[PDB]
Design a protein around this ligand. Structure first.
Ligand SMILES: Cc1cc2nc3c(=O)[nH]c(=O)nc-3n(C[C@H](O)[C@H](O)[C@H](O)COP(=O)(O)OP(=O)(O)OC[C@H]3O[C@@H](n4cnc5c(N)ncnc54)[C@H](O)[C@@H]3O)c2cc1C
Ligand SMILES: Cc1cc2nc3c(=O)[nH]c(=O)nc-3n(C[C@H](O)[C@H](O)[C@H](O)COP(=O)(O)OP(=O)(O)OC[C@H]3O[C@@H](n4cnc5c(N)ncnc54)[C@H](O)[C@@H]3O)c2cc1C
Lengths: 343, 346
């Protein structure tokens, strides 16, 4: 089970890597920590994205869909819910990847596309809270439309919370914010927009229980307790959003034995073709640093394409330097046939 | 003055995204293109399906052009069409003057060269007054496959491109004729074998010698064929005529310029990984840019363009940030987004 190309990470860079790897006819695997492909766009799926080349403005949610679909065009082996723990370069020059459960994967080449690492939202510490993640307890704003005309309480006071409140005020029926401190630890320019308009803020307050109402499995009321007086208010709500920050895991390369050059203790020091200091090991997306790195989704595509063209030649030296342009690539002939049936 | 921040030469993918991103970073932006339509080399393949633009599900070149043009015009740059830029002059203060073929002049703090492989023009039919029918059914590209559904088309020429057109139209058209001036179908001897096992009928040592219009409409109804080795003069009823005799190419822009601009292999601008040329304030993006990490795709044009724009902004405003603000949080979209979000809420 030795793969041609194994992509670590399922964001824009990893997904396009898998795509272009399949366009160049390589046995391809993609390994992602979360149960869902898409990467960091999951942090802002409600926002409008204008700066992807060739795309008219689209929401994060819709962009994730289009990238996942393109990334799976050639049916790579998809390994979700898996944290890659370490990368080993074997003596024969192939690579072995160890997962958190000790399972192992083997590859001729590895494309590191871990972006800024593993992100996990800090969870609400109340007993049966995770029961409501399947209904109306959220850790992101999945879409603005989800909250049209609904009553929403945001727990937390970061810049993310102030941002969420400000975009939801025009849309929700009502917006509540509860912060456990006495001052909104946000930016003192967008904090006043929040305060001159519709949002109602509670300070030194937190959520202490989630009431599901008689017959349903979704939150209807929220118990609020004040930390300076002591009141135990109750509040009817349609939606709850927790913004208590994020937990980060960047240990992948520290846990590995590879003389891979690192910039600023995190980023892979690459060149303009996405090569690292280790043969057959490439870097694409936010994990990649070089003088020409473009810190946009559009840059991730360039990083990925360069990585794959190099991987192809590493594996097959007589391969051409570049992939066949898709309009004339025979690899799409069968698929194009079905689509052409559009008359 | 009429002094622009960024003037883009070339309206293809690289130029259009440059214009967009230049607007994203709040610079006075102008874009100059030779043809009457923006879009670049994609007008050579508008019927093909394009799969490898990042984030894009397969779409025809026709639709991609539409999408690229709308994005490139987001911030309403000054668009100068039907205009050939003849030379680039670096003025004594380090600004630039661009001279068009009619002598007009444009001025800019920075210049982004996005001319691809240059100005491309189809080789026209050497027949009197043929241009009359360009408005009707005399085509120099396959603008779409559906345009030829169940129709009768003759293709003149026999190169790899002519063989490719016939091959994609044979399953779609009622009937495909190919007429070639040579003895052999001088394409590539692989897909040439697909053409002659299929329903496409070839006429060798033949060329089109006159076009015959209909009487009650002014398309072409009959084509006069002349076999050049016998002498026969056939006539042939058709719905569509497609010419493919090659292209004319105009690459003189940089030869005609007095710029100390390093050139690779007599054509490409020798850039670095940030799309900089050897001349301060002159950038290159797209197929015209060569450096060790240049990606020869539409996807690569976008990175060349963003990198070029970020550099132009710092050249013009040294304290500007090295990076543009991501669109999702960039205040320059706020009023536009408000209108979009309103539509989204039913
Ligand atoms: C708020 C915000 C807004 C942005 N907006 C824009 C915008 O409008 N336009 C734009 O062009 N760019 C934008 N970006 C820039 C950024 O490039 C993209 O957001 C994108 O996420 C980068 O893609 P990437 O694949 O390289 O990294 P990521 O998207 O971070 O993908 C990395 C993936 O790898 C996984 N992973 C990491 N480590 C491991 C491991 N050890 N094992 C398994 N899986 C692992 C992670 O779970 C994640 O899914 C924005 C960034 C932010 C933070
Ligand atoms: C047949 C074919 C298929 C392709 N398929 C794909 C594909 O499927 N996917 C992919 O990613 N890439 C593909 N490409 C690759 C190529 O990058 C794109 O086609 C694209 O055209 C390059 O963008 P560009 O803006 O830099 O240059 P161009 O598209 O060539 O645009 C340059 C523009 O500048 C104008 N111009 C030039 N000189 C002047 C001047 N002096 N004054 C004024 N205007 C001027 C020209 O008129 C033209 O409009 C393909 C290329 C070809 C030939």
């Amino acid at each position: 089970e030795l793969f041609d190309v194994t992509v670590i990470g399922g964001g824009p860079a990893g997904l396009y890597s898998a795509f272009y790897s399949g366009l160049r006819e390589m046995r391809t695997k993609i390994i992602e920590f979360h149960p869902h492909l898409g990467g960091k766009i999951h942090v802002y799926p409600e926002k409008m994205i204008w700066d992807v080349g060739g795309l008219l403005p689209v929401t994060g949610d819709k962009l994730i869909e289009q990238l996942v679909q393109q990334g799976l065009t050639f049916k790579p082996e998809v390994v979700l819910d898996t944290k890659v723990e370490s990368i080993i370069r074997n003596q024969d020059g192939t690579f072995t990847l160890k997962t958190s459960t000790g399972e192992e994967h083997f590859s001729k080449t590895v494309i590191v596309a871990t972006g800024s690492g593993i992100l996990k939202p800090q969870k609400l510490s109340i007993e049966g809270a995770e029961r409501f993640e399947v209904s109306n307890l959220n850790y992101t704003v999945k879409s603005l439309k989800r909250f049209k005309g609904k009553t929403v309480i945001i727990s937390g006071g970061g810049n993310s919370a102030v941002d969420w409140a400000n975009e939801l005020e025009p849309i929700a029926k009502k917006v509540y914010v509860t912060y456990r401190k006495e001052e909104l630890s946000g930016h003192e320019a967008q904090v006043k927009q929040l305060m001159n308009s519709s949002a109602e803020c509670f300070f030194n307050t937190s959520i202490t229980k989630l009431i599901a109402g008689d017959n349903h499995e979704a939150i209807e009321y929220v118990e609020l307790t004040n930390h300076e007086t002591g009141e135990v208010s109750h509040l009817p709500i349609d939606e709850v959003i927790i913004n208590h920050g994020y937990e980060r895991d960047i240990t992948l390369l520290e846990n590995s034995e590879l003389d891979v050059a690192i910039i600023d203790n995190y980023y892979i020091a690459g060149n303009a073709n996405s090569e690292s200091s280790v043969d057959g090991l490439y870097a694409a997306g936010d994990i990649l640093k070089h003088e020409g790195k473009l810190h946009l989704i559009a840059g991730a595509f360039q990083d990925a394409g360069n990585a794959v063209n190099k991987a192809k030649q590493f594996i097959q030296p007589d391969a051409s330097e570049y992939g066949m342009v898709s309009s004339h690539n025979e690899v799409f002939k069968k698929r194009n046939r079905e689509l052409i049936k559009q008359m």
